[PDB]
Amino acid sequence: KLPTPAEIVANLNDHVIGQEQAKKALAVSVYNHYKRLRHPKAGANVELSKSNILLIGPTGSGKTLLAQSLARKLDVPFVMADATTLTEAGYVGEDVEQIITKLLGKCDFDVEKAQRGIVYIDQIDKISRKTRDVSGEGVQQALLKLIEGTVASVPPQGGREFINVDTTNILFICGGAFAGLEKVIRQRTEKGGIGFGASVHSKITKLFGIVEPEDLIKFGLIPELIGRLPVIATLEILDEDALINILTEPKNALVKQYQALFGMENVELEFEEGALRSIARQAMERKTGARGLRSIVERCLLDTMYRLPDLKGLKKVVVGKAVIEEGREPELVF
Amino acid sequence: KLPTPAEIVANLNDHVIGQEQAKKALAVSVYNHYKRLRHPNVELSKSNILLIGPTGSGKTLLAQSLARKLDVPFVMADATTLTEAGYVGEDVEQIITKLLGKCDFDVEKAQRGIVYIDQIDKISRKTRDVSGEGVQQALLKLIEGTVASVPPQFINVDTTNILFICGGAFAGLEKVIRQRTEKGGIGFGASVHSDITKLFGIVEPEDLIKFGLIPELIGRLPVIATLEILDEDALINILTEPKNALVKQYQALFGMENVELEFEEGALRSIARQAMERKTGARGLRSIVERCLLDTMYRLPDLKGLKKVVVGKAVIEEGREPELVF
Numbered sequence: 001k002l003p004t005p006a007e008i009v010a011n012l013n014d015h016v017i018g019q020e021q022a023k024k025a026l027a028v029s030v031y032n033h034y035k036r037l038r039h040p041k042a043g044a045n046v047e048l049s050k051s052n053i054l055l056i057g058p059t060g061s062g063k064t065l066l067a068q069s070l071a072r073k074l075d076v077p078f079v080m081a082d083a084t085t086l087t088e089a090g091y092v093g094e095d096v097e098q099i100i101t102k103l104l105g106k107c108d109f110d111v112e113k114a115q116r117g118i119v120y121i122d123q124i125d126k127i128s129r130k131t132r133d134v135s136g137e138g139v140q141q142a143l144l145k146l147i148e149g150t151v152a153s154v155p156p157q158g159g160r161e162f163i164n165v166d167t168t169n170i171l172f173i174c175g176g177a178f179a180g181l182e183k184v185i186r187q188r189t190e191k192g193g194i195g196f197g198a199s200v201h202s203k204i205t206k207l208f209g210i211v212e213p214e215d216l217i218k219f220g221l222i223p224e225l226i227g228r229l230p231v232i233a234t235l236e237i238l239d240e241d242a243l244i245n246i247l248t249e250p251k252n253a254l255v256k257q258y259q260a261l262f263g264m265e266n267v268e269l270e271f272e273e274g275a276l277r278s279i280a281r282q283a284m285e286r287k288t289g290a291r292g293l294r295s296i297v298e299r300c301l302l303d304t305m306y307r308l309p310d311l312k313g314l315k316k317v318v319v320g321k322a323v324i325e326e327g328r329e330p331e332l333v334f
Numbered sequence: 335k336l337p338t339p340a341e342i343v344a345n346l347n348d349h350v351i352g353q354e355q356a357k358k359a360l361a362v363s364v365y366n367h368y369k370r371l372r373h374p375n376v377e378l379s380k381s382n383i384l385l386i387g388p389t390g391s392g393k394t395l396l397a398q399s400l401a402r403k404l405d406v407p408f409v410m411a412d413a414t415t416l417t418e419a420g421y422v423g424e425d426v427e428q429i430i431t432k433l434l435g436k437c438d439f440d441v442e443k444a445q446r447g448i449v450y451i452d453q454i455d456k457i458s459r460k461t462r463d464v465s466g467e468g469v470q471q472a473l474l475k476l477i478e479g480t481v482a483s484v485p486p487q488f489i490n491v492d493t494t495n496i497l498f499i500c501g502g503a504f505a506g507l508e509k510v511i512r513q514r515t516e517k518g519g520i521g522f523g524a525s526v527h528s529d530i531t532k533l534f535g536i537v538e539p540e541d542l543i544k545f546g547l548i549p550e551l552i553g554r555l556p557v558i559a560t561l562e563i564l565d566e567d568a569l570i571n572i573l574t575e576p577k578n579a580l581v582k583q584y585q586a587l588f589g590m591e592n593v594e595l596e597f598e599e600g601a602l603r604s605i606a607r608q609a610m611e612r613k614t615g616a617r618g619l620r621s622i623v624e625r626c627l628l629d630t631m632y633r634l635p636d637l638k639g640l641k642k643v644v645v646g647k648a649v650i651e652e653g654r655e656p657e658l659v660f
């Protein structure tokens with residue numbers, strides 16, 4: 001049978017912390033994706049179209065991790081695409097049908113399976129409008145007919161007879177960090193006016209949560225592509241508390257990754273709660289999202305990691321709060 | 335015998351709401367197409383069709399719906415994949431290869447087919463414009479009769495009798511038309527004065543030339559049919575009347591469970607209004623319904639005993655839960 005959307009989110013929960021709405025949007029679409037694919041395809045039965053998703057969120061919020069985490073249990077062909085390598089048909093670069101070639105390769109060129117797969121297109125915000133915009137609007141236009149059902153003509157599994165792939169039922173998840181999108185939403189929601197007769201109006205998570213096509217059009221996406229991404233799911237910006245859970249709760253938590261490296265030696269690595277909050281706070285100030293957690297941990301551990309493989313008798317190393325706030329050595333337990 | 339244009343529209347009516355002028359233009363052209371193919375005497379030339387309309391107006395659906403009852407080979411081409419003959423990309427003769435493939439490479443049948451070229455507006459003029467004007471130029475001798483040479487199942491295909499339906503959302507065209515018909519000048523003696531349906535309905539070759547199509551291609555598309563921007567009422571029928579209406583699609587998805595989905599009349603009108611504000615045409619209807627039903631669809635497979643879901647007007651305007659009836 002099919003897993004319920006709650007089971008999909010439960011699996012996503014082992015990897016992504018926060019973004020409850022983005023996890024919900026992905027889980028429901030994938031569940032509906034499954035249902036559509038087992039729906040009768042002939043007779044008096046209504047034809048079912050698909051709802052594609054656009055993921056809008058800040059750097060290091062978990063967009064790509066959601067897609068990668070989702071992929072672990074999809075049971076349909078899944079591919080990670082990259083919009084920065086796409087160009088118009090007549091130019092250097094990859095054409096939009098290259099995506100289908102990659103999805104098709106993932107299932108050993110079994111087309112019937114490729115047509116049931118799910119495509120994640122990363123960096124969708126990088127092909128916005130803001131001559132011939134070969135790598136920008138030209139790609140958005142080329143994708144219009146790939147996202148909506150067409151028949152892609154892609155090379156065979158050998159060297160360059162081409163394969164006809166019906167993309168009608170391929171689910172597309174697009175996303176990116178629309179960095180300039182908050183200013184547009186603020187301009188629309190806080191217009192106001194200047195001068196007497198006119199009235200003057202009051203002045204990331206909140207703004208993205210209210211995004212509308214008008215903003216994406218002014219940002220630089222074309223209306224024809226926006227309407228083909230009917231579901232807009234947003235990711236918030238991680239705060240100090242979310243960044244603490246990301247250090248220890250996930251299946252591949254940052255702390256767990258270092259404990260494993262120290263575990264290839266015979267030394268146990270422990271962080272104090274004061275350190276975890278200090279790390280999360282410092283990382284938050286770097287404005288790189290969760291990624292900033294790695295810089296802090298690499299920083300505080302650099303000198304103990306240098307010595308560790310040469311030290312003999314060490315059993316446990318403790319990273320206290322002081323080791324994050326001040327240039328202190330971690331306590332070494334022999 | 336042949337279906338009358340009224341029968342062609344009657345079949346289009348089960349898929350496309352409104353757009354009466356576009357349906358009339360297609361029905362008459364297809365009927366004339368059938369008549370040409372039966373005429374052995376004056377030599378007859380074909381009238382090709384250009385479909386101009388906004389996003390979500392139903393152009394491609396008309397072509398898809400039309401294709402269900404054509405009795406001749408039919409394909410949809412994609413102008414965004416076409417390039418000049420000497421460059422990477424698909425040469426315009428691939429259109430014939432696809433039309434020819436649909437009939438298992440029976441050339442006599444392929445030569446009698448109908449081709450819809452989507453995204454025709456994407457090969458406008460605005461060096462060597464390999465993916466733009468170069469394609470328009472390449473198509474001139476494909477749309478007007480030539481002898482194509484295409485790979486085996488080379489095969490010679492006479493395109494004289496192939497009907498071409500081209501279309502696209504000439505997004506910048508409404509600005510061009512306003513510049514022509516609304517002078518918008520400054521001064522005491524100036525005519526000064528600041529609606530997609532009204533504008534497109536008066537489109538002239540002059541506007542398409544200024545937009546970016548070449549006069550040689552415009553003259554080969556003698557029939558310009560225009561689609562209206564969907565209004566509030568059209569967008570309500572699009573939710574429930576078509577064979578593949580949006581609401582019916584969700585009722586079917588809910589029907590993959592044992593739960594019945596019901597919309598109130600007030601909800602349908604509210605959805606249509608919100609869809610218009612998104613400026614995506616009918617496609618905006620899907621965004622609104624997805625928004626309103628996201629939480630219900632998430633929980634519905636886990637809920638036990640649920641038998642009916644009611645989406646009222648208050649569930650479109652306010653962030654409320656659809657009434658769950660157990």
Ligand SMILES: Nc1ncnc2c1ncn2[C@@H]1O[C@H](COP(=O)(O)OP(=O)(O)OP(=O)(O)O)[C@@H](O)[C@H]1O
Pocket residue numbers: 015016017018019058059060061062063064065066176177246250289290291
């Ligand atoms: N919500 C989250 N929960 C758990 N880990 C997260 C979260 N957000 C980011 N991370 C961590 O950040 C790292 C990279 O995240 P990710 O690849 O999702 O960023 P991204 O979406 O690619 O950002 P960008 O859009 O700038 O490319 C991973 O190690 C991941 O564990």
Ligand SMILES: Nc1ncnc2c1ncn2[C@@H]1O[C@H](COP(=O)(O)OP(=O)(O)OP(=O)(O)O)[C@@H](O)[C@H]1O
Pocket residue numbers: 049224349350351352353388389390391392393394395396502503572576615616617
């Ligand atoms: N007049 C209409 N009647 C019924 N459904 C419509 C109508 N117009 C649009 N739609 C709906 O809009 C969705 C997409 O329609 P369609 O593919 O015709 O748009 P489009 O022609 O691709 O727009 P564009 O050419 O700008 O991409 C479908 O769900 C279709 O049912």
Ligand SMILES: [Mg+2]
Pocket residue numbers: 063064122
């Ligand atoms: Mg990424």
Ligand SMILES: [Mg+2]
Pocket residue numbers: 393394452
């Ligand atoms: Mg279309």
